[PDB]
Swiss-Prot record, chain B:
Residues of the full protein shown: 863 to 947 of 1057
Similarity comment: Belongs to the RAG1 family.
Tissue specificity comment: In the adult, predominantly expressed in the thymus with lower levels in the pronephros, mesonephros and ovary.
Record remark: domains: The RING-type zinc finger mediates the E3 ubiquitin-protein ligase activity. The NBD (nonamer binding) DNA-binding domain mediates the specific binding to the nonamer RSS motif by forming a tightly interwoven homodimer that binds and synapses 2 nonamer elements, with each NBD making contact with both DNA molecules. Each RSS is composed of well-conserved heptamer (consensus 5'-CACAGTG-3') and nonamer (consensus 5'-ACAAAAACC-3') sequences separated by a spacer of either 12 bp or 23 bp.
Record-given protein name: V(D)J recombination-activating protein 1
Site annotation Essential for DNA hairpin formation, participates in base-stacking interactions near the cleavage site: residues: W53
Subunit structure and binding partners: Homodimer. Component of the RAG complex composed of core components rag1 and rag2.
Function: Catalytic component of the RAG complex, a multiprotein complex that mediates the DNA cleavage phase during V(D)J recombination. V(D)J recombination assembles a diverse repertoire of immunoglobulin and T-cell receptor genes in developing B and T lymphocytes through rearrangement of different V (variable), in some cases D (diversity), and J (joining) gene segments. In the RAG complex, RAG1 mediates the DNA-binding to the conserved recombination signal sequences (RSS) and catalyzes the DNA cleavage activities by introducing a double-strand break between the RSS and the adjacent coding segment.
Cysteines joined through disulfide linkages: none
Compartments, as annotated in UniProt: Nucleus
Curated annotation (Swiss-Prot), chain C:
Summary of the function given for this chain in its UniProt record: Catalytic component of the RAG complex, a multiprotein complex that mediates the DNA cleavage phase during V(D)J recombination. V(D)J recombination assembles a diverse repertoire of immunoglobulin and T-cell receptor genes in developing B and T lymphocytes through rearrangement of different V (variable), in some cases D (diversity), and J (joining) gene segments. In the RAG complex, RAG1 mediates the DNA-binding to the conserved recombination signal sequences (RSS) and catalyzes the DNA cleavage activities by introducing a double-strand break between the RSS and the adjacent coding segment.
Gene, per the UniProt record: rag1
Domain topic, free-text comment: The RING-type zinc finger mediates the E3 ubiquitin-protein ligase activity.
Tissue localization of expression: In the adult, predominantly expressed in the thymus with lower levels in the pronephros, mesonephros and ovary.
Protein family according to the UniProt entry: Belongs to the RAG1 family.
Name of this chain's protein: V(D)J recombination-activating protein 1
Assembly and interaction partners: Homodimer. Component of the RAG complex composed of core components rag1 and rag2.
Source organism of the structure: Danio rerio (Zebrafish)
Length: 285, 85, 115
DNA sequence: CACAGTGGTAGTACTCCACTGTCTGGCTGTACAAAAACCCTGCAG
DNA sequence: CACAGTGCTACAGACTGGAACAAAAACCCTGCAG
């Protein structure tokens, strides 16, 4: 006469095949007339509200947070920050991720490849920009990421050695990215000013402190070559202030000013080399 | 061999140096033929006796090198007091 | 003719009511014919196949958190393990704790004094 | 008149475990309107 | 034959779908039995 069957939440997800057939068909039939392929929402609005029908609220918080705002688990930007800024090795981070996931999870942290995929936005060679007037003797391509700083040394044996390894951002790109990163603080500074928005967009002035200093006693790696000296030179800048001038009169008007310029937190590395400060040759190259 | 000079020699540059193919880049340097053969042969002797005291438990992992170690060392010492005296 | 129709995401509950009335009724009727009428158990299960038809992993997680569970708190010993084994400084760790706790927290990590 | 840390403490401060009633806010069936934003068609340049 | 990693790569593994097979679970049943 059939068969007694125990409740669903104890069966495997597979066990289900039998139970939703009619609902899969009904949602499919439904989707064409009112949307056309919008799968997410039909399920979402019936469900949240259906729960709060025989309601204790407890769930409404967890469910209303569940998709678009915010995280649920933790938004990959917050993860990325909580890796980069507490100094976790990538392998160390993943180590932790595995641990928190396996034990009582409900994993919280986001996996590495989705951190990497959340990365491309912060680094330079991402945000579009254009220069008026166009820059002299510089490429107009704005997508360039980390560039080997050798910058076209022909590495011909006959010539000066190519020995030194380096990496640098293309200067302008590094600028527009570092600075667009300040969009938040510059807009909030503008609203503190209670200053006009649409008008006076173009009168800005940006003051950049750049610094370059040498570092000795840096060991090196066996590696595949090329041979390179021990000492390393780190070229970096920092944005000290950003101000406005238009309409006219009014001095120049500060908006954002770095509060603790001596902090590690604000210094922007640009060119990293292995070079001794003493040899002028490769340094100017 | 992709190796760079050291002041004090770490055991890692010792593991790259001890291998036979490392003794190959040097075998090319020594003009003399029989010398070239001698130190090469020496190094292979050394590769044969090294895992005995390097490996955790040779009684299982590397039995044959262990049983032949006395004879192998004999051979070694002979070669030293022979051409290198 | 008719007004330029809705774009989901913009409204409060009772436009929502006849937006789905007939499907909620079909569901009531279903729960009734085979599963007596326990809507909570029915509705929670509904999401999974529509999502997991072509999906994430994230879906397994967010949905897996539900009513049972949980965590609650990672046992202080496990957390401690994460700390000394990933080489986290107390101030660095506490940094992480504060950060994960303020955002979406639901604090996971256990505080210093309990460690 | 760097700066971003470095762990233990004692400080403070806040926010929790039982006993209870009482409260507002919120949901469920259809009925009842008034706004909401098109597009109609209608009447006019 | 020290060992915990060192990031980004490689693509191994984790997923759907109907179309249909089969086995097994645990009921009801009828069969042949004291």
């Amino acid at each position: 006469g059939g068969r007694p069957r125990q409740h669903l939440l104890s069966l495997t997800r597979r066990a289900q095949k039998h139970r939703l057939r009619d609902l899969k068909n009904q949602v499919k039939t439904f989707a064409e007339k009112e949307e056309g392929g919008d799968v997410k929402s039909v399920c979402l609005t019936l469900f949240l509200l259906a729960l709060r029908a025989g309601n204790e609220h407890k769930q409404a918080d967890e469910l209303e947070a569940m998709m678009q705002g915010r995280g649920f688990g933790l938004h990959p930007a917050v993860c990325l920050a909580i890796r980069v800024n507490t100094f976790l090795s990538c392998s160390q981070y993943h180590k932790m991720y595995r641990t928190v996931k396996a034990t009582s999870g409900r994993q919280i942290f986001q996996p590495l490849h989705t951190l990497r995929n959340a990365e491309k936005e912060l680094l330079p060679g991402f945000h579009q920009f254009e220069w008026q007037p166009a820059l002299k003797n510089v490429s107009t391509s704005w997508d360039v990421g980390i560039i080997d700083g050798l910058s076209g040394w022909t590495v011909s044996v006959d010539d000066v050695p190519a020995d030194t390894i380096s990496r640098r951002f293309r200067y302008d790109v590094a600028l527009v990215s570092a600075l667009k990163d300040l969009e938040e603080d510059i807009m909030e500074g503008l609203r503190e000013r209670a200053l006009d928005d649409s008008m006076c967009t173009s009168g800005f002035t940006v003051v950049v402190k750049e610094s370059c200093d040498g570092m000795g006693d840096v060991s090196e790696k066996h590696g595949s070559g090329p041979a390179v000296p021990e000492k390393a030179v780190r070229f970096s800048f920092t944005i000290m202030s950003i101000s406005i001038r238009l309409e006219g009169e009014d001095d120049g008007i500060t908006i954002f000013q770095e509060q603790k310029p001596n902090s590690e937190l604000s210094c922007r590395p640009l060119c990293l080399m292995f070079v001794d400060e003493s040899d002028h040759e490769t340094l100017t190259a | 061999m992709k190796l760079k000079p050291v002041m004090r020699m770490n055991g890692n540059y010792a593991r790259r140096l001890m291998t036979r193919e490392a003794v190959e880049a040097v075998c090319e340097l020594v003009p003399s033929e029989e010398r070239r053969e001698a130190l090469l042969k020496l190094m292979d002797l050394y590769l044969q006796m090294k895992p005995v005291w390097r490996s955790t438990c040779p009684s299982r992992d590397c039995p044959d090198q262990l049983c032949q170690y006395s004879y192998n060392s004999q051979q070694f010492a002979d070669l030293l007091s022979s051409m290198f005296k």
